[PDB]
Design an enzyme around this catalytic site. Sequence first.
Site: not given
Length: 287
Positions: A190, A222-228, A266
């Site tokens: 999470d 991922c969700s935003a497509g930047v961090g993971r 990120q």
Amino acid sequence: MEAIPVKQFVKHIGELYSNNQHGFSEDFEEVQRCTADMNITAEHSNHPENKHKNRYINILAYDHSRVKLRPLPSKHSDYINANYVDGYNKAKAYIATQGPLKSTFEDFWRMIWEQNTGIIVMITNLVEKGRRKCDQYWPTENSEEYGNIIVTLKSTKIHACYTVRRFSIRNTKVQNERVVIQYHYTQWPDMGVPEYALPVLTFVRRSSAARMPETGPVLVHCSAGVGRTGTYIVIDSMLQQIKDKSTVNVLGFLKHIRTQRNYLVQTEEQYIFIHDALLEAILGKET
């Protein structure tokens, strides 16, 4: 290449962790400032017609690197929040993108079709700690239609920390049938980054190895497509660089891909986790 030998990697890690992780903080601030004197445009992202097709209003698709959908018989029918991202020694090895919305399911699947993408890497759960991160863009079983693309789930394989889903996709307007394999990592926390890097290592290697010759870019979201997403791309790319050159250039490579999509890797936690993972990979190979 301003890279670090694998043999020095362990030593370099020591340095970056030493002095209360000052090394890491410098490096990531450099990553964060590497765009300081760069204005990268994302105009199509913020066109009124395209604002609903972005999951996060501040996570845009740089115009210059963005994946364009073929226009339709439809003013902004060409926009998806997706960017080409280079891999190790291979331009546009990836499409980094957001987790698609119900509204962008068609765009998403059409992009996969049009880009000749055969691998989806998904590094999020649909919902996390009660928070929506990604809508389910694939059929739970059998088939689902997303515009001109019908997606059939063929096989599912559920490991500890990732699920592999074999899909057969067909363009109803077109051969017409393609295998697309999703590798869905299912144990990302999470909050923060994984405690153990090895399952993520394992995930990267198997998902990376699924890339077949003469195929379009691997889609990572991922969700935003930047961090993971950014974390995946860096780990995978650096594992290739290690295999190919026994060197690592995380800072160099990351500064590069920061120009292709906003905020890839990120957080400093993600930046460090990349190093942990490559460390464990290197020490794995050594034995």
